[PDB]
Amino acid sequence: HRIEPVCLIIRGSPGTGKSLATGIIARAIADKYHSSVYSKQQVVTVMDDLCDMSLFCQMVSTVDFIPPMASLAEGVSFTSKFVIASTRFYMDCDIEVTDSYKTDLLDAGRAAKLCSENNTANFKRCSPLVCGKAIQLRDRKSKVRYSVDTVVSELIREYSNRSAIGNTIEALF
Amino acid sequence: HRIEPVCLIIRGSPGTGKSLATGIIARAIADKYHSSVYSLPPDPHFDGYKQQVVTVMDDLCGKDMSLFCQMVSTVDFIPPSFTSKFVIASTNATIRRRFYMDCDIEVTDSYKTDLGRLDAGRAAKLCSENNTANFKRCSPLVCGKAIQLRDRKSKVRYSVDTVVSELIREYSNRSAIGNTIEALF
Amino acid sequence: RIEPVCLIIRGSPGTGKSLATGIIARAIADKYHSSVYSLPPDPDHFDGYKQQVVTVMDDLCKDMSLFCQMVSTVDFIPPMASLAEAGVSFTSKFVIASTNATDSDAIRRRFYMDCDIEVTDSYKTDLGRLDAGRAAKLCSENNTANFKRCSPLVCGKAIQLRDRKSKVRYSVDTVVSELIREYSNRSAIGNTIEALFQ
Amino acid sequence: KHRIEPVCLIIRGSPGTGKSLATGIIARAIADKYHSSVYSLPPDPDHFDGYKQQVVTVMDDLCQNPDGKDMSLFCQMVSTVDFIPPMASLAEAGVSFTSKFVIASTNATNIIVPSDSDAIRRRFYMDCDIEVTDSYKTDLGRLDAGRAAKLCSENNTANFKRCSPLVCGKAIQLRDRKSKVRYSVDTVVSELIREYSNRSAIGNTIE
Amino acid sequence: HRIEPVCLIIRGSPGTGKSLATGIIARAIADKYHSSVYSLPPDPDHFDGYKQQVVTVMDDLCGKDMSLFCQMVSTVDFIPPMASLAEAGVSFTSKFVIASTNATDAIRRRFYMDCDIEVTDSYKTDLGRLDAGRAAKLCSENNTANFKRCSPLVCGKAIQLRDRKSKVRYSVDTVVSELIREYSNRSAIGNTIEALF
Amino acid sequence: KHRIEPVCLIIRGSPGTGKSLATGIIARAIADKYHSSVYSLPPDPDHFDGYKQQVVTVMDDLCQPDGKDMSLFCQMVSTVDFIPPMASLAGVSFTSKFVIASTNDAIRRRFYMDCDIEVTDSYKTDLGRLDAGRAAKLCSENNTANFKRCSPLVCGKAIQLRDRKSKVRYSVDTVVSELIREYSNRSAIGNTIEALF
Ligand SMILES: [Zn+2]
Ligand SMILES: [Zn+2]
Ligand SMILES: [Zn+2]
Ligand SMILES: [Zn+2]
Numbered sequence A: 001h002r003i004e005p006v007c008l009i010i011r012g013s014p015g016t017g018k019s020l021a022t023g024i025i026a027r028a029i030a031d032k033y034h035s036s037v038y039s040k041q042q043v044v045t046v047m048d049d050l051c052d053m054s055l056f057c058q059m060v061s062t063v064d065f066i067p068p069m070a071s072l073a074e075g076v077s078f079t080s081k082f083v084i085a086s087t088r089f090y091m092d093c094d095i096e097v098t099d100s101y102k103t104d105l106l107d108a109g110r111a112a113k114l115c116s117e118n119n120t121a122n123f124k125r126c127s128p129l130v131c132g133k134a135i136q137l138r139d140r141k142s143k144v145r146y147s148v149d150t151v152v153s154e155l156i157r158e159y160s161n162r163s164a165i166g167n168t169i170e171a172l173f
Numbered sequence B: 001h002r003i004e005p006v007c008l009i010i011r012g013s014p015g016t017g018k019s020l021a022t023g024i025i026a027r028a029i030a031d032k033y034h035s036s037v038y039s040l041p042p043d044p045h046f047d048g049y050k051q052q053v054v055t056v057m058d059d060l061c062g063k064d065m066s067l068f069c070q071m072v073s074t075v076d077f078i079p080p081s082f083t084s085k086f087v088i089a090s091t092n093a094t095i096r097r098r099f100y101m102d103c104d105i106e107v108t109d110s111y112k113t114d115l116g117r118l119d120a121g122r123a124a125k126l127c128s129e130n131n132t133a134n135f136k137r138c139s140p141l142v143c144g145k146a147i148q149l150r151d152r153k154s155k156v157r158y159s160v161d162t163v164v165s166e167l168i169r170e171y172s173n174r175s176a177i178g179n180t181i182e183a184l185f
Numbered sequence C: 001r002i003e004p005v006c007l008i009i010r011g012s013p014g015t016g017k018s019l020a021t022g023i024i025a026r027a028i029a030d031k032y033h034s035s036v037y038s039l040p041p042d043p044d045h046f047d048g049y050k051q052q053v054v055t056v057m058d059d060l061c062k063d064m065s066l067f068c069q070m071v072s073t074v075d076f077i078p079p080m081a082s083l084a085e086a087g088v089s090f091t092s093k094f095v096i097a098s099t100n101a102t103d104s105d106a107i108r109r110r111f112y113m114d115c116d117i118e119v120t121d122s123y124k125t126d127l128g129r130l131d132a133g134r135a136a137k138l139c140s141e142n143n144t145a146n147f148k149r150c151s152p153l154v155c156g157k158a159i160q161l162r163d164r165k166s167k168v169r170y171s172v173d174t175v176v177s178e179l180i181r182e183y184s185n186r187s188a189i190g191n192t193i194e195a196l197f198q
Numbered sequence D: 001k002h003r004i005e006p007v008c009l010i011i012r013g014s015p016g017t018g019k020s021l022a023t024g025i026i027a028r029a030i031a032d033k034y035h036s037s038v039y040s041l042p043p044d045p046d047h048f049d050g051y052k053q054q055v056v057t058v059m060d061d062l063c064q065n066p067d068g069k070d071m072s073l074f075c076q077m078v079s080t081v082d083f084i085p086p087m088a089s090l091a092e093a094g095v096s097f098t099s100k101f102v103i104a105s106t107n108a109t110n111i112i113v114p115s116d117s118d119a120i121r122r123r124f125y126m127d128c129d130i131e132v133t134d135s136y137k138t139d140l141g142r143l144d145a146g147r148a149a150k151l152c153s154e155n156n157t158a159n160f161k162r163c164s165p166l167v168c169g170k171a172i173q174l175r176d177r178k179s180k181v182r183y184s185v186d187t188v189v190s191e192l193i194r195e196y197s198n199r200s201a202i203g204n205t206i207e
Numbered sequence E: 001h002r003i004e005p006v007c008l009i010i011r012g013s014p015g016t017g018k019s020l021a022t023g024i025i026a027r028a029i030a031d032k033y034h035s036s037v038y039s040l041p042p043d044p045d046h047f048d049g050y051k052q053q054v055v056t057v058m059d060d061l062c063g064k065d066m067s068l069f070c071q072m073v074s075t076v077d078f079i080p081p082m083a084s085l086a087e088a089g090v091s092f093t094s095k096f097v098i099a100s101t102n103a104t105d106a107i108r109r110r111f112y113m114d115c116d117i118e119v120t121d122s123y124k125t126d127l128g129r130l131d132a133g134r135a136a137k138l139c140s141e142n143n144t145a146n147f148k149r150c151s152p153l154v155c156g157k158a159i160q161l162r163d164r165k166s167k168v169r170y171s172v173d174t175v176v177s178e179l180i181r182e183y184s185n186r187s188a189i190g191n192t193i194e195a196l197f
Numbered sequence F: 001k002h003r004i005e006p007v008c009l010i011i012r013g014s015p016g017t018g019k020s021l022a023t024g025i026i027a028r029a030i031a032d033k034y035h036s037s038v039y040s041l042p043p044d045p046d047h048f049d050g051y052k053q054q055v056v057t058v059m060d061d062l063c064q065p066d067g068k069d070m071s072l073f074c075q076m077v078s079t080v081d082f083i084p085p086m087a088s089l090a091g092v093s094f095t096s097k098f099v100i101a102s103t104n105d106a107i108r109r110r111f112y113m114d115c116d117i118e119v120t121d122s123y124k125t126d127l128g129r130l131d132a133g134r135a136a137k138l139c140s141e142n143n144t145a146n147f148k149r150c151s152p153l154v155c156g157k158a159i160q161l162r163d164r165k166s167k168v169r170y171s172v173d174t175v176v177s178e179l180i181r182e183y184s185n186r187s188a189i190g191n192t193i194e195a196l197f
């Protein structure tokens, strides 16, 4: 059977543009792993607007899982290393828009620009959406804040330790 | 309905290593496809059948093969459904449209016993080198040193590894286009 | 017998020319409640041929000596590999074949329809070939005469054929209508003649 | 009354991968270095008619499938022991086999070693798979001989008067199964020549 | 050395056309290469007149003939006997050898094709012979690959040729097309090799 | 030892009249018929590198001046053998069956046709030159003799070629049909003599 997939769910109110986070997050994870995002044995699968829970609980597990397809059968057991959800959770995070980057009533127009400096970890270029300047993440069963860049740093680190240990443990048996 | 699974039947005498061959063959094919291997009993119900990519039919001996003509069929099956892509079987010393390959297993004199059977103890002990496609290390069973499969039609002798690679290619052949075709019907 | 109606589909590798013959044979076999016999490349025997309505000859290039025999009104008794199924006559109503990029008249006649496969630019991958994976995606809508569910392969979105003589454009669905129609009209002629003499 | 074992190359490959071109060219070049010629053994050989002690004998399609007559012939040619091969006509009967090199080819996966396996594989000095590169690949995944034959503009070889993609590696390579090292026609010639120059230096330093 | 020439043999009883087939086959082939035919006499002794013609013919091959035949169809230089000191010296470099012989080890290996010749029933004379006059009479339609006018001798209506290993049938026209194909192969191969050295 | 003179076509136009679209497509259609390809000479050329005896060779911008192009041209279009320059020391006699050239005594006798290009005013920009973006939209119908699919370039809708010597207008597809007819006629000539005898 399989390593449990590391998974990040993003809780927030509409207009926070959470899909802008799970998108930026998944892409940046599928690149490191030279892959794409699924929304064919992809690395990351994005599950946006999660109310679904029987289908989730069957992805994020250690069992072997075969998901339904429209086409009959067709080599496809679910193997995605990461699951990013927006609404088993390695991380469980609240979305927070800095008041500065809020519209009259999130202001993506302003929140998406290129800061002069590029001090990122996982992005070829920097922005307020990844520098933490415009948007932050807080685990709720741990009181740590993240930027888009540092949450993707965490999730790659955690998958790596889980794989090393989880792989040599299964060898024991 | 389905693409008829590729099937190999390994014919051999006793002491020839039939179920070492079939064992290893189906298990390497599984490992490629992130699946496992259902061991059908000799004189076979289908308890434990959990849509494994491969199922091994040992000591084919008729009760047995009226069930085989259903497993290796293009139509569907609900065994006392069956979606395994591969069937590896083995029979006595001495329908066939279903056998994609039909191999006589054969032991090299070097790994023969004094009583003229395979020397599995030694044959099982690993070789240092790996000129192999489907295994992370080989033994004289995978490499043709101890165990070889001679196609009955071709009359040619192959190693287990190369006959593996051929069962995977002949299914990738069926699989490419034929999958979306039925998806349409 | 009634000369089977033949479609040859000419296309370079990658334009998806055996998706076409595959779907076309399968769709004509269903309409006629049969199946499809696929005749292997460089055929020596016809071993699974139990009188399916459609036989497919992919990658036809010993090929045209055969091809000449199947697509005619003369009696063909193909060679079998097992005696247990020998002696039967070749009676498929349709022969769908595909071949390479581009006596000679001896064949040209056999083709009721001689088509080129085209790949729409929208479904053309980087390397100038069919976008195989995208084109299988079912369509929301099914405006087809012959299929239970539509797809860019069936209706005209990914691939289309074009008769070389007539220049008509066709989709997999429309070409199916065109082959069936022709057989209906051949069967209709031949029937009324054998109705006057049985 | 015996001799230095000929340095032997076997080339394994699917048909239509340049296998017989490669044997052709390696033989001819090696033959050029030693100012001799190529004797080509026929398939399923019965008799060596035409074998005039050429430095290289080529043995294409070793072990076509019939009955193993080929591996017994090959074990006699590639040995230290004297060998007087049969001939159809009496006009050239009695000549000893004295090729310094023997180049053979066969299919990709067939096992030609019958029985006494470990001693046979020793005779092969190099036991190579033939691979076409993917630019020179063509539909059906086989070699496009026409293009692979256009003369290269450069000649970096060690052994050829002129160079084409069959010679320098651009179109066809060989990989030594045991060493996993990739070679072109040009560099496996140099290896074969170095190994023979090696065996002659020994024999004569010991005698 | 030289490319072994591709060789065809036409086994047939007398008056089954066997000698017309070799002449027609050899002439057409020689025409395609812009050359002529050198025809060995029966019970050949010498090669007088041989000027390295693309094709040489050998009829009633019955061993003087054999030992002789076996050196023509080879890789190894064969300078054949002359009866005129002025001619002698020439090596044998013909690209094809066409031969015929009587009704019924290592030789069989040198025949690139080996054929029984067949007179079709229609054209059999009153007693199991070729009706040469009528078979020579020309055809109105011309579907041959290698003659500018057609005739039963060439398209397969009069005489046919049956290969004894492949059991395949040929007309004079088609066997001329196999042979030209089979030299083109060898030609092409040994060509790129020679170009390189 | 000498060659059927290739048939030539020159397309005299101001630049921006799809002069280049015209020669490009014309050359490809002809080469696709003869199962070959097209060798494009750079304008004001010096070497023929890449020449492999493509059936069609193209000669963009003829007389751009100083006689460079024209001595090259008179040699390509002739009966006398021709060995063009190579800049890579790379058998390359010039043997192309057609020469399509575009520009801006014994010379004007080698032209088979000698044509002005002409946009039709339905497809003229406000600034005077071919609206390429519209002219390359595929036509739905295909009445052409030499194409898989039709375009106002192929077709005569957007681009036309008028012979100066005779006053016949042409489309890409019908000039293609005339040029082929001419070439096959010149190779008929050997076959038509042989017919009368
Ligand atoms: Zn920033
Ligand atoms: Zn091994
Ligand atoms: Zn559709
Ligand atoms: Zn090179």
Ligand SMILES: [Zn+2]
Pocket: E139, E141, E150, E151, E152, E154, E155, E156, E157
């Ligand atoms: Zn005739």
Ligand SMILES: [Zn+2]
Pocket: F139, F141, F150, F151, F152, F154, F155, F157
């Ligand atoms: Zn048009």
